[PDB]
Design a protein around this ligand. Structure first.
Ligand SMILES: O=C(O)c1cncc(Cl)n1
Ligand SMILES: O=C(O)c1cncc(Cl)n1
Ligand SMILES: O=C(O)c1cncc(Cl)n1
Ligand SMILES: O=C(O)c1cncc(Cl)n1
Lengths: 24, 91, 91, 24, 91, 24, 91, 24
């Protein structure tokens, strides 16, 4: 039996940039 | 996607390409994307592509990764929890 | 995230950090979060962070966790189903 | 071959509180 | 949840409690729930609990289950596809 | 490496009933 | 469902029936579906069924598949990234 | 312990058709 568990959390980070047309 | 500062990826034990859940404290959006390694120590949290419609610069977000593990490991596993300042530097 | 009374977590066989799906009977919201252990016998069902945009105090919710298992175990496995009173105490 | 099956259900609990700005 | 006629569950190789994705052709809703065994040959497709906000009687739906398997098995595994008439009887 | 693959599909079923307040 | 040109499925290492996430750059829609093999070299990206409510002809989309793998393989695995021209031909 | 990782990406394809009433 496999359970799905929290592994990683970065808490209350601020989004610094967004790019709709990112290529990569 | 989401570009994350390599320091936060190391701190949170995230690999490039690992599936990441982003939850937005400001507007309540919740979506699934994958991690891209960002310039180390830059504090970058970059939303790339379609996700930019839902999660915006200046939003407070929580980034989450999950693992599938056997019952035995699940009872003993200790998650990596990374708290950050206003500039996305670990504490 | 979601803070759950430790009695309901024991009754439902839920671990701290286990992935949980919350579905809201009042407004039809559906989201995925993880379980946090709440004060035992308090009847606490606490929505923390971004989820509070979608799930509100006084809402009736269903909390669901899933397990991945081999075909053979899947045919025999019996889920833990917990009924609660108006005060979130097991029956 | 792994199936996803229902493991746990807490049925028709009442949300007692909500905190947008929880830290933990 | 979703109550499914036992004949469709056998035809589709679904177990009671297996995770199911419902997609609604009428309104475009998409959600994840689990299968409950319904009266055999009744043609029942019953939406239970919070899902009833999104998926309604008379809607045309597609019910999907997925499995995780290793690359080798994935290339040889054949999915169970069940077509039904207007009365939810297999063809 | 594990892939997620289609296992089961019931195609174009008609929803016959709904119960918001189902108990079970 | 999503019908994909067999050339892009080979290029991206996608099997018929593999779970696929579609994200829409035009309107921000995000959904989970499975891959169907389309006519090779046709450049077909076909939205079938309920998904057509959310993703429309002419929309720019990103198609994503994920794999579950042991920690060791996850650190070394190299994903298949396929860039395409305006006619959905690989570059 | 299994992680979910990116395996495949087709970047910035153009949707060529959509059919609500597809059967297959
Ligand atoms: O534009 C996006 O949201 C996006 C881009 N690349 C991958 C994924 Cl999962 N999402
Ligand atoms: O604030 C939330 O809704 C939240 C908190 N922590 C983890 C997740 Cl997935 N969501
Ligand atoms: O109320 C629902 O929609 C429901 C009920 N039981 C389980 C799940 Cl996942 N959803
Ligand atoms: O109409 C749809 O979107 C659809 C059809 N078949 C499977 C899935 Cl997941 N979705």
């Amino acid at each position: 039996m496999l359970r799905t568990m929290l592994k990683s959390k970065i808490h209350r980070a601020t989004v610094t940039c967004a790019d709709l047309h990112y290529v990569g | 996607x989401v570009t994350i500062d390599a320091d936060l990826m190391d701190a949170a034990d995230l690999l490039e390409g690992e599936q990441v859940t982003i939850v937005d404290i400001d507007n309540g959006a919740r979506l699934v994307t994958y991690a891209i390694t960002g310039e180390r120590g830059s504090g970058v949290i970059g939303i790339n592509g379609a996700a930019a419609h839902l999660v915006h610069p200046g939003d407070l977000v929580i980034l989450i990764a999950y693992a599938t593990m056997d019952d035995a490991r699940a009872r003993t596993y200790q998650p990596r929890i990374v708290f950050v300042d206003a500039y996305n530097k670990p504490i």
